[PDB]
Write an enzyme that holds these catalytic residues in place. Structure first.
Site, PDB file in Angstrom:
ATOM      1  CB  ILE A 130     -21.954 -36.032 -18.397  1.00 27.89           C
ATOM      2  CG1 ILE A 130     -21.112 -36.907 -19.872  1.00 27.89           C
ATOM      3  CG2 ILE A 130     -21.987 -36.453 -17.441  1.00 27.89           C
ATOM      4  CD1 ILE A 130     -20.295 -35.877 -19.664  1.00 27.89           C
ATOM      5  N   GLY A 131     -25.014 -34.811 -17.144  1.00 31.71           N
ATOM      6  CA  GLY A 131     -26.250 -34.231 -16.247  1.00 31.71           C
ATOM      7  C   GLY A 131     -25.866 -34.996 -15.204  1.00 31.71           C
ATOM      8  CB  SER A 132     -25.471 -37.519 -12.706  1.00 34.81           C
ATOM      9  OG  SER A 132     -25.069 -38.079 -11.667  1.00 34.81           O
ATOM     10  N   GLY A 133     -21.845 -37.384 -13.496  1.00 34.15           N
ATOM     11  CA  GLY A 133     -22.086 -35.406 -12.905  1.00 34.15           C
ATOM     12  C   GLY A 133     -20.843 -35.246 -13.526  1.00 34.15           C
ATOM     13  CB  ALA A 134     -22.061 -32.645 -15.134  1.00 34.64           C
TER      14      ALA A 134
ATOM     15  N   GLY B 216     -21.594 -28.896 -13.467  1.00 33.61           N
ATOM     16  CA  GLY B 216     -22.576 -28.020 -13.992  1.00 33.61           C
ATOM     17  C   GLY B 216     -23.107 -28.431 -15.395  1.00 33.61           C
ATOM     18  CB  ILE B 217     -24.321 -26.784 -18.728  1.00 36.01           C
ATOM     19  CG1 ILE B 217     -24.659 -25.732 -17.758  1.00 36.01           C
ATOM     20  CG2 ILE B 217     -25.180 -27.595 -19.487  1.00 36.01           C
ATOM     21  CD1 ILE B 217     -24.796 -24.284 -18.328  1.00 36.01           C
ATOM     22  CB  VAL B 218     -20.618 -31.545 -18.229  1.00 42.33           C
ATOM     23  CG1 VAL B 218     -18.825 -32.369 -19.096  1.00 42.33           C
ATOM     24  CG2 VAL B 218     -20.230 -30.364 -17.088  1.00 42.33           C
TER      25      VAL B 218
ATOM     26  CG  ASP C 226     -15.367 -27.191  -1.738  1.00 47.26           C
ATOM     27  OD1 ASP C 226     -15.675 -28.005  -0.476  1.00 47.26           O
ATOM     28  OD2 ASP C 226     -16.337 -26.887  -1.307  1.00 47.26           O
TER      29      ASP C 226
HETATM   30  C1  LIG Z   1     -16.006 -43.246 -23.030  1.00 51.82           C
HETATM   31  C2  LIG Z   1     -17.439 -42.594 -22.798  1.00 51.82           C
HETATM   32  C3  LIG Z   1     -17.704 -42.064 -21.865  1.00 51.82           C
HETATM   33  C4  LIG Z   1     -18.563 -41.161 -21.062  1.00 51.82           C
HETATM   34  N1  LIG Z   1     -18.632 -40.622 -19.801  1.00 51.82           N
HETATM   35  C5  LIG Z   1     -19.587 -40.128 -19.166  1.00 51.82           C
HETATM   36  O1  LIG Z   1     -20.647 -40.232 -19.383  1.00 51.82           O
HETATM   37  C6  LIG Z   1     -19.046 -39.797 -18.114  1.00 51.82           C
HETATM   38  C7  LIG Z   1     -19.542 -39.406 -16.873  1.00 51.82           C
HETATM   39  C8  LIG Z   1     -19.358 -38.549 -15.676  1.00 51.82           C
HETATM   40  C9  LIG Z   1     -18.426 -37.622 -15.840  1.00 51.82           C
HETATM   41  C10 LIG Z   1     -18.174 -37.198 -16.841  1.00 51.82           C
HETATM   42  N2  LIG Z   1     -16.875 -37.016 -16.921  1.00 51.82           N
HETATM   43  C11 LIG Z   1     -17.394 -34.902 -16.669  1.00 51.82           C
HETATM   44  C12 LIG Z   1     -15.903 -35.059 -17.043  1.00 51.82           C
HETATM   45  N3  LIG Z   1     -15.996 -33.882 -16.937  1.00 51.82           N
HETATM   46  C13 LIG Z   1     -16.625 -31.995 -15.881  1.00 51.82           C
HETATM   47  O2  LIG Z   1     -17.375 -32.412 -15.131  1.00 51.82           O
HETATM   48  N4  LIG Z   1     -16.092 -30.965 -15.808  1.00 51.82           N
HETATM   49  C14 LIG Z   1     -15.410 -30.607 -16.279  1.00 51.82           C
HETATM   50  C15 LIG Z   1     -15.281 -30.913 -17.723  1.00 51.82           C
HETATM   51  C16 LIG Z   1     -14.388 -29.461 -18.582  1.00 51.82           C
HETATM   52  C17 LIG Z   1     -13.589 -29.285 -17.381  1.00 51.82           C
HETATM   53  F1  LIG Z   1     -12.777 -28.061 -19.176  1.00 51.82           F
HETATM   54  C18 LIG Z   1     -13.733 -28.529 -16.563  1.00 51.82           C
HETATM   55  C19 LIG Z   1     -14.403 -29.580 -16.121  1.00 51.82           C
HETATM   56  C20 LIG Z   1     -15.196 -35.749 -17.558  1.00 51.82           C
HETATM   57  N5  LIG Z   1     -15.871 -37.478 -17.826  1.00 51.82           N
HETATM   58  C21 LIG Z   1     -18.032 -38.389 -18.272  1.00 51.82           C
HETATM   59  C22 LIG Z   1     -19.636 -40.654 -22.183  1.00 51.82           C
HETATM   60  C23 LIG Z   1     -19.647 -41.839 -23.223  1.00 51.82           C
HETATM   61  N6  LIG Z   1     -18.489 -42.335 -23.516  1.00 51.82           N
END
Ligand SMILES: Cc1cc(NC(=O)c2cccc(-n3cc(NC(=O)Nc4ccc(F)cc4)cn3)c2)ccn1
Length: 342
Positions: free
Chosen positions: A26-30, A32-34, A145
């Site tokens: 994902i990178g942004s955002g994320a 951490g390492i997502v 926060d």
């Molecule tokens: C249909 C689809 C959607 C896509 N989504 C993205 O590219 C995108 C972009 C930013 C943020 C997110 N996103 C990030 C999370 N989760 C977290 O950032 N942190 C987290 C993860 C798991 C945990 F258990 C706790 C914290 C969810 N969505 C997704 C990409 C492709 N297709």
């Protein structure tokens, strides 16, 4: 033949359960390492976060352990729900990494902030942020926060809060790692070590709302000095009554800063920042400005509650009828591991 398989994503190795396929970063955002992934079992797209040796220090340990515990005992549509938790490691001795799985969202809130949003969308994100915060508050969780980077949205504008914030009865340390701590959305009570109540998170909802309208960080800066200057430079020096609740040192510093009268909210968030084409939008702008003017109040004693915010004419339209003590690396590794394994 193994239940797991490894894949190098971005720079980080992801040893995951064979059910998760086509892992894209994902990178942004994320955050951490997502990763984004397709769950073969659930037939849906998931987000996989890797927690690397989380027991490596007190800071990393307290947060991972408390978030794992709280993700289990919390249930709300605007708060992180976990689909799965796992470790590829077979023993407590071998244990290294933790993997948290949730539903895949489409973007983080910073991305959404950058966009020109209507009052329908804007008040819907804000209603949900307050719904989530109200639920956390009821669970004895005062965030302190809340920031857009740890908030995610779906295409249908459904929102979720990903973390449980500042560790109550702690006690933060330093980080030997290179990563930025976003302090811009923290309440004056956080900035000035004051003691807080539930509406410490309202300040945060006001900084976010303000940024949705302005498209600029409201109170930027290198640290709380730079930051505090911007808070008083815009809302004006707090009243004498606020100073009395300060520690003798904080009080002395705060009272000795050059005084500011502060800009009015029509001058802070002028009419030009809002849609004006119709009467509806003309009304929604003054209602929007009113809510901000009540959230962005330095003295908490005067700043609006979560319950009053949900009953604000701008928001109200969406209404529908252990263990912060010190432990060692070994002590933490166990507490975390037997929470993954339950
Ligand atoms: C249909 C689809 C959607 C896509 N989504 C993205 O590219 C995108 C972009 C930013 C943020 C997110 N996103 C990030 C999370 N989760 C977290 O950032 N942190 C987290 C993860 C798991 C945990 F258990 C706790 C914290 C969810 N969505 C997704 C990409 C492709 N297709």
């Amino acid at each position: 033949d193994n239940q797991f398989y490894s894949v190098e994503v971005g720079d980080s190795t992801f040893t995951v359960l064979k059910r998760y396929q086509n892992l894209k970063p994902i990178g942004s955002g994320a955050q951490g390492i997502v990763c984004a992934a397709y769950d073969a079992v659930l037939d849906r797209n998931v987000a996989i976060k890797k927690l690397s040796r989380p027991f490596q220090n007190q800071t990393h340990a307290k947060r991972a352990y408390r978030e794992l515990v709280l993700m289990k005992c919390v249930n709300h549509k605007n708060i992180i729900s976990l689909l799965n938790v796992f470790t590829p490691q077979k023993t407590l001795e071998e244990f290294q990494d933790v993997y948290l799985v949730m539903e895949l969202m489409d973007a983080n809130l910073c991305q959404v902030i950058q966009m020109e949003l209507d009052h329908e969308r804007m008040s819907y994100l804000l209603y949900q942020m307050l719904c989530g915060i109200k639920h956390l508050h009821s669970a004895g969780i005062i965030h302190r926060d809340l920031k857009p980077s740890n908030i995610v949205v779906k295409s249908d504008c459904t929102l979720k809060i990903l973390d449980f914030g500042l560790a109550r009865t702690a006690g933060t340390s330093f980080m030997m790692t290179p990563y930025v701590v976003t302090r811009y959305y923290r309440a004056p009570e956080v900035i000035l070590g004051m003691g807080y109540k539930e509406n410490v998170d309202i300040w945060s909802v006001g900084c976010i709302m303000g940024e949705m309208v302005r498209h600029k960080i409201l109170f930027p800066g290198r640290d709380y000095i730079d930051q505090w200057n911007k808070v008083i430079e815009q809302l004006g020096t707090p009243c004498p009554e606020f100073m009395k609740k300060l520690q003798p040192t904080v009080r002395n510093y705060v009272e000795n800063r050059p005084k500011y009268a502060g800009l009015t909210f029509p001058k802070l968030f002028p009419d030009s920042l809002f849609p004006a084409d119709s009467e509806h939008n003309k009304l929604k702008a003054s209602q929007a400005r009113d809510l901000l003017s009540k959230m962005l109040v330095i003295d908490p004693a005067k700043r609006i509650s979560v319950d009053d915010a949900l009953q604000h004419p701008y928001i109200n339209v969406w209404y529908d009828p252990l263990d912060e003590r010190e432990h060692t690396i070994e002590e933490w590794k166990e507490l975390i591991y037997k929470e993954v394994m339950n």
